[PDB]
Structure formats: structure tokens, C-alpha cells
């Protein structure tokens, strides 16, 4: 093997969830980052609560959207985030029902990756683990993706609408790629994941809004 890393084989990635009709794609991506780190330090993985983020991160719009950096900042200020079981996901805004007794993780800040620098992203995923990214998933090609390495020259790096999680990187039929985890269920794309193009001149803005929490 050359320069390839898949955290799935490692146990840093939890099962693929489905955001539903709520636009909490930012909360799931952040949770993904947090979870990847929780394995890195604790040696044990656990499903964190995306709802907790949705209901408590006042700086975001709940099901209307939000940024990953704001979510991390919340977990730090709040000093902890509940596990899924402790604070279940219902797919809609409601009152923040944080349960201190249910805290299962915490963090001390975050570090945004250099805007538009793919290489700094490869290292971040290689040295830290799953990274929260933001891409353009408006095109139908992306939506009906099934297999192989995605790459559509119509993708717009400036229009960042869907937030996902980079679980790693690797090669395919000569095509380098970023292993992406989406929150649309195990029934979308390749069992919930998608292989997007790497080094194709920041395809879809993969490295345009990356970040990861610090433990
Ligand atoms: C998410 O649902 N909402 N995304 C965002 O709020 C993100 C936040 C991160 C920062 C990326 N985008 C964002 O804030 O954009 C700002 C920006 C732009 C340009 C430069 C810098 C910053 N994304 N949603 C979709 O792609 C989407 C999702 C659904 O979900 C429903 C569904 C769930 C399961 C199965 C099927 C469907 C619906 C419509 C669109």
C-alpha cells in the first residue's frame, strides 16, 4: 500500500446515519469528527448526539443549517456532548435538553484547515483522523452516485451546501480519492459513502471549509 488511509477499517467511524428531512448535515459531520477523536484518545468509540448539537448550538439555525466550527466551539464552552442514547435524534428542532449525566465526550477547540489547500487536508486526515468538510452536492451526478471515483467539472467550489466527513483518502483505477461519509442513510451511494476525486483542483471545494476538533 502507498499513501492510503481508511479509518473505517480502524474503528474510528461509526455506522452511517440519515439526517432525514432536517438540514442537520453540519451536526452529523461534526459528531463524526468528534467520534473519530474519541477513538484516537479513549480507545473506545461511541455514537455522539447530532440532535444535541441541533438543539443547543444557538449560533446555528438547527434544521436550517450551520457550521461545524460553531458546533465544536459549543462543545468546548459547554464542556461536553451527550451520547446518542442519552440524547436521541428525532429529526427536528426542539428545546436543548442537555444531560450532564449523559456527557460522553468533550474537546478544547478546533483548527480550520488552510482554505483551499488539499495537501494540508491529506495531512490533517493522516495525522488527526476524520475531518469535517463542506462540499457542493447540488448536482444530480453526485446525488445518484453509485460507485467509482466521482468528479464533475460543473461542481462549484464556491457553492458549499452539504457538510460531510472525510474518512480518509486513497487511489482507485489510477484515480486518487477522498473517502466521504454522508448522512443520507446506508441506502445512498455506496452503502452510505462516496469516493470523491482528490487533487482534481479542489473538486467541489472539498478543502474549502475543513476543520477538526482538538482533544
Ligand atoms: C446540509 O443539510 N446543510 N448544510 C449546511 O448548512 C452547510 C454547512 C457547512 C458549513 C458546510 N453549508 C453551508 O453552511 O454553506 C455556506 C457556505 C457556502 C459557500 C462558502 C462557504 C460557506 N446540506 N444539505 C444538502 O445537501 C441537502 C440535504 C437535504 O437532506 C435531506 C435528506 C436526508 C436523507 C436522505 C435524503 C435527503 C435536502 C436538501 C439538500
Rounded to a whole number of angstroms, the distance between the first and last alpha carbons of the chain is 29
145 C-beta closer than 6 A to ligand 1:
no
Q: Which residues are catalytic?
A: 25, 162, 182
In the chain, which residues are last before a break of more than 2.5 Å from C to the next N? none
Q: Using the atom order of ligand 1, give the atom closest to the CA of residue 19.
A: 33
Reported residue count of the chain is 215
What is the stated resolution of the deposited model, in angstroms?
2.4
Task: Tell me the domains of the chain and their CATH numbers.
Answer: 1-215 (3.90.70.10)
Which residues make Cβ contacts (< 8 Å) with residue 177, sequence separation at least 6?
149, 169, 170, 171, 195, 196, 197, 198
Distance 25 CA to ligand 1 centre (A): 6
What distance in Å separates the CA atoms of residue 215 and residue 197, rounded to the nearest whole number? Answer: 29
Cα–Cα dist 94/52, whole Å: 10
Nearest to 207 by CA among 171, 157, 154, 162: 157
Query: Which atom of ligand 1 is found nearest the CA of 20?
Result: 33
Contact at 8 Å (CB) between 35 and 104? Answer: no
Contacting residues for 90 by C-beta, under 8 A, at least 6 apart: 51
| β-sheet bridge partners, residue 179 | 168, 195
Cα-to-centroid distance, 123 and ligand 1 (Å):
25
Amino acid at each position: 500500500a502507498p499513501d492510503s488511509v481508511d479509518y473505517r477499517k480502524k474503528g474510528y467511524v461509526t455506522p452511517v446515519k440519515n439526517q432525514g428531512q432536517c438540514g442537520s448535515c453540519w451536526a452529523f459531520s461534526s459528531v463524526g469528527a468528534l467520534e473519530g477523536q474519541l477513538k484516537k484518545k479513549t480507545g473506545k468509540l461511541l455514537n455522539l448526539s447530532p440532535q444535541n448539537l441541533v438543539d443547543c448550538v444557538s449560533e446555528n439555525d438547527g434544521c436550517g443549517g450551520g457550521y461545524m466550527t460553531n458546533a465544536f466551539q459549543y462543545v468546548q464552552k459547554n464542556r461536553g456532548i451527550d451520547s446518542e442514547d442519552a440524547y436521541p435524534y428525532v429529526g427536528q428542532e426542539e428545546s436543548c435538553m442537555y444531560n450532564p449525566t449523559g456527557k460522553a465526550a468533550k474537546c478544547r477547540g478546533y483548527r480550520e484547515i488552510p482554505e483551499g489547500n488539499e495537501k494540508a487536508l491529506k495531512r490533517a486526515v493522516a495525522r488527526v483522523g476524520p475531518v469535517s468538510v463542506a462540499i457542493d452536492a447540488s448536482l444530480t451526478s453526485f446525488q445518484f452516485y453509485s460507485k467509482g471515483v466521482y468528479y464533475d467539472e460543473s461542481c462549484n467550489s464556491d457553492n458549499l451546501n452539504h457538510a460531510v466527513l472525510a474518512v480518509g483518502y486513497g487511489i482507485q483505477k489510477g484515480n486518487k480519492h477522498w473517502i466521504i461519509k454522508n448522512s443520507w442513510g446506508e441506502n445512498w451511494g455506496n452503502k452510505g459513502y462516496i469516493l470523491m476525486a482528490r487533487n482534481k483542483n479542489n473538486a467541489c471545494g472539498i478543502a474549502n471549509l475543513a476543520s477538526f476538533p482538538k482533544m
